[PDB]
Design a protein around this ligand. Structure first.
Ligand code: MNR
Length: 152
């Protein structure tokens, strides 16, 4: 798990995201969709988005970004004590949405990229290490639920 110091870094970085939840959420999703177009196909509501311009201009995409990062933020604030929060997400993403764990790897990488892009020189080596750990914990706990379900 993460140390106390590491959690404090994670939640410090998260303060940056909370100042513009929609903006961060939008850029995370755009980074995901442009970098991995197959991910767009998982969203009936975004598969019409043919271009990044269209993505950028989609208010519904920004809305979904807000939903996504709010759920993640709730999880992070549990500092690993997130069974109740993570379980339903694992379950909807395996059973309803059919999201392979690879796609969660993709979006983890996207969050790290977006943090550097929006805060260049203000996302330190230590902060990246701690946020990366937190994201991997999230992914790893989901992967455990995926194995339970025999998904992917
Ligand atoms: C590659 C695609 C997927 C990735 C990666 C992904 C990663 C993540 C993620 C990691 C940080 C968080 C947090 C996250 C959180 C959510 N997510 Mn998700 N998610 N996610 C979807 C695809 C994906 N998610 C699909 C598709 C829906 C249904 C969208 C709709 O039509 O409303 C969805 C829905 C949701 C919902 C709405 C409630 C529900 O359905 O469980 C939340 C909350």
């Amino acid at each position: 798990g993460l140390s106390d110091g590491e959690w404090q870094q994670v939640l410090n970085v998260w303060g940056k995201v909370e100042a513009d939840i929609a903006g961060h959420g939008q850029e995370v999703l755009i980074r995901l969709f442009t970098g991995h177009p197959e991910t767009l196909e998982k969203f009936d509501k975004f598969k019409h988005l043919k271009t990044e311009a269209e993505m950028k201009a989609s208010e519904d995409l920004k809305k979904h970004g807000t939903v996504v990062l709010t759920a993640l933020g709730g999880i992070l604030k549990k500092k690993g004590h997130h069974e109740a929060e993570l379980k339903p997400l694992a379950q909807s993403h395996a059973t309803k949405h059919k999201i392979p764990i690879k796609y969660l790897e993709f979006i983890s990488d996207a969050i790290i990229h977006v943090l550097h892009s929006k805060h260049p020189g203000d996302f330190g080596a230590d902060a990246q290490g701690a946020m990366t750990k937190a994201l991997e914990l999230f992914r790893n706990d989901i992967a455990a639920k995926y194995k339970e379900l025999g998904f992917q």
